[PDB]
Symmetry: D2
Subunit: 213 residues, 4 copies
């Protein structure tokens, strides 16, 4: 099981593992009441009637590289398991999300988009050089890192079941979410679709509350 | 699929699993940006109480157990369950009848075989009543209320290895009811087979119960 | 005190509550300090737009007496805390739910409803008798009890936040749920409404998925 | 009840449901006294690891903390969080600047007072860049990504006493970052005030950390 989607300038969402498939929900559901067409139909039935427990039996592990401001929003999803790169224990790499100029179109900035991008690059560089200077000076990493900006990239593993993934997408795959987290949500959705096509289609048709998928 | 028989009619069966010991290693290694190195990290993790990397190992079991066992089991909230429904299915004539040997250590007034026999009789009376009620048109969801707590039920249980260790701490232990201890022994056997390093680590550094140190696999 | 009788020997009792509607408003705004129309409008906005995290800051503790078959459905609600009456910290008692004849009227049975009641009562009586006999003979109660029917009453404390309570109502205050647990959920709703009227009205207006609370006062 | 933490931080108690006797009532399952026997039950529960009764005591705190502290805190999943968002209320911009004493015990190339200064300098320049972006029409959600991890945020945290004890095990400990230990000590103090018997039995039998005994 492997898929990797690149996101933003340096980010990604990578599928590490998966347990089960659409039929894992069918099998869990069928236990209640003690054929391809009827199995597809049952998935559509569960989704329509809001019986989402059978989808908890499908599980994913992702490996994600995202800016801290993205990761912070993401880790609000409590029904999941995380392990994240540590700024207390690791020397942090010079990797920051610098938005492209096209990210500001629609907005009428009094300076050109290219200069916004550059100003972001500049402050980031200054902050990172300060962080290094502090570390080289003997300041512990856990203190030195507090000067680094929220666009610093972090990495995490994320284990999450299909039900929680549907909740995650209802919130994040939506135009009211910040564009950057939308991009990550589209990548999660794309992988979900690949691995669980019937669940994903049913989700879209019956349960999905957002407007971008 | 690994299937272990438990009690007179029960079982624990492994349906699926995601990951293995290395899945915990991979997840732990992310913090800080070889076999005996990897196995050493598992022990270190367990020794210092960082159980989060073990959440990335996930099992699905299919379990057949008496309702009284299932009700205890289902108290474990950090897990997913789907169970056979007495509202929606006619229920099978299957009930846990304790063996005579279940009743020793206990000074009783009637022989253990008599205890066994009186349990059987009540089971048989209740099931016959249940069948009569269904035949008379009583909806299943009402008719089943007369059935005893030793009725067998069936469920799928999806659970990560951290939560499985919690479960073992509470149920693979002499304070737990003997019947659920038996199920927790089978759960432990399957955990050990799929996750040997995590399992040996758990036993050596974090397991809080008594029997898994006493009783092989 | 609020205690509502349910079924023949059941009940829902309110033990404690943290917060009120304004606990959700304060949490949404992250402000520890009142403007009724504004605060009520925010409750509705949150509910309409599916931002239910603020409602997690209101919490209830109930004491419920219910038959085991109801409890097994109820305890499937994992986002909550339960303590069930065990025989380790308090005395156990033995009572059972015997459906009334009217529970079956509207079902074509080949025996009168009263005979159903009698047959249920009869088996309950024999099972209880077997149980007592086993106990009196030295059989430990964890084994003796396995003969007892699923209509045996149990009791539990349930601590649950308003968001999770609303999820419980969606599934249980609904004609697809078993009638018995419907009756419990109507009592839960009555209490929730009493304590959190604005949240409860907004819930029914924008988020509630069931049928019965829109038909049945309280 | 409010306790100030760091230079501009705080923890304040917003609400509480229950007290020590709420655990006692849950354990016995009885809505309907004896100090001695009730305390004994609390100790008995704690020493045998039966922590479910403590889930029936619940707290709401209001916390002001730097983002790097909040990221660690929000990893506690068995709890409810609401974080300050500009959608429902006014944002302000303050930053945690460490005191020179925070470096004591570290032999550093530059004086601790100069470390402090270098931190204030970046905060200042990052904040100034943020305001320049905002004034030029960059949306806030983009402009803010240049702000440092010491930026203060605020949140409401609703947590039951069991999950609160878990939190204290991990954060009221010398292996946890100093800054979050400080907040964990405040949480502990409020917990002790409201549930003395529970808090006492926790320290005696179940608490895994070091600092609350010191
Ligand atoms: C009419 C009816 C018929 C039913 N028939 C059956 C049956 O045949 N068999 C059967 O087993 N059960 C059956 N159920 C029970 C049902 O499947 C659920 O177990 C129960 O209603 C709890 O739902 P919940 O998870 O939303 O509640 P909680 O378990 O309190 O969950 C509430 C919220 O938490 C989230 N959540 C909690 N844990 C997880 C998790 N691990 N993964 C993802 N999200 C999570 C969800 O977003 C949800 O909105 C039936 C229920 C009803 C109402
Ligand atoms: C000194 C220290 C160093 C740390 N270093 C790192 C690091 O390098 N990287 C990193 O990512 N994190 C790190 N952490 C964070 C830590 O690993 C946990 O994320 C955090 O402490 C939450 O733990 P918890 O799951 O018990 O709390 P909650 O998340 O509130 O969970 C509480 C309880 O519920 C159970 N539980 C809850 N959810 C689940 C679940 N999904 N599966 C199984 N059981 C569950 C647990 O058994 C636990 O007893 C560190 C923490 C400390 C204190
Ligand atoms: O002491 C620690 C170290 C890391 N974490 C968590 C918090 C974040 O999700 C990551 C990284 O935190 P950091 O403070 O950068 O090491 O892991 C923690 O909760 N406590
Ligand atoms: O050993 C025990 C005893 C009770 N419980 C739980 C399960 C039920 O919800 C109640 C009552 O269980 P009982 O087996 O009736 O004592 O408490 C348990 O999980 N383990
Ligand atoms: O309406 C229902 C039907 C089943 N369940 C759950 C409760 C048990 O775990 C199983 C079987 O319950 P039963 O009441 O036998 O259908 O599924 C439920 O919660 N609600
Ligand atoms: Cl609706």
């Amino acid at each position: 099981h492997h898929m990797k989607i690149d996101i933003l300038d340096k980010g990604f969402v990578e599928l590490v593992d998966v347990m089960g498939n659409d039929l894992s929900a069918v099998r869990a559901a069928r236990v209640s009441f003690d054929d391809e067409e009827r199995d597809r139909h049952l998935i559509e039935y569960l989704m329509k009637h809001g019986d989402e427990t059978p989808f908890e039996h499908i599980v994913f592990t992702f490996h994600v590289k995202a800016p801290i401001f993205v990761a912070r929003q993401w880790f609000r999803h409590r029904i999941a398991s995380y392990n994240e790169l540590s700024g207390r224990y690791s020397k942090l790499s010079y990797e920051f999300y610098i938005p492209s100029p096209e990210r500001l179109e629609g907005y009428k900035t009094t300076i050109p988009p290219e200069r916004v991008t550059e100003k972001i690059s500049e402050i980031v560089d200054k902050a990172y050089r300060t962080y290094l200077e502090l570390i080289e000076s003997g300041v512990p990493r856990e203190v030195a890192r507090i000067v680094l900006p929220l666009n610093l990239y972090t990495r995490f593993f994320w284990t999450v079941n299909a039900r929680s993934l549907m909740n995650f997408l209802n919130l994040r795959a939506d135009s009211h979410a910040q564009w950057e987290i939308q991009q990550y949500a589209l990548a999660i959705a794309r992988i979900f679709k690949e691995k669980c096509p019937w669940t994903f289609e049913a989700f879209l048709k019956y349960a999905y509350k957002g407007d971008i998928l």
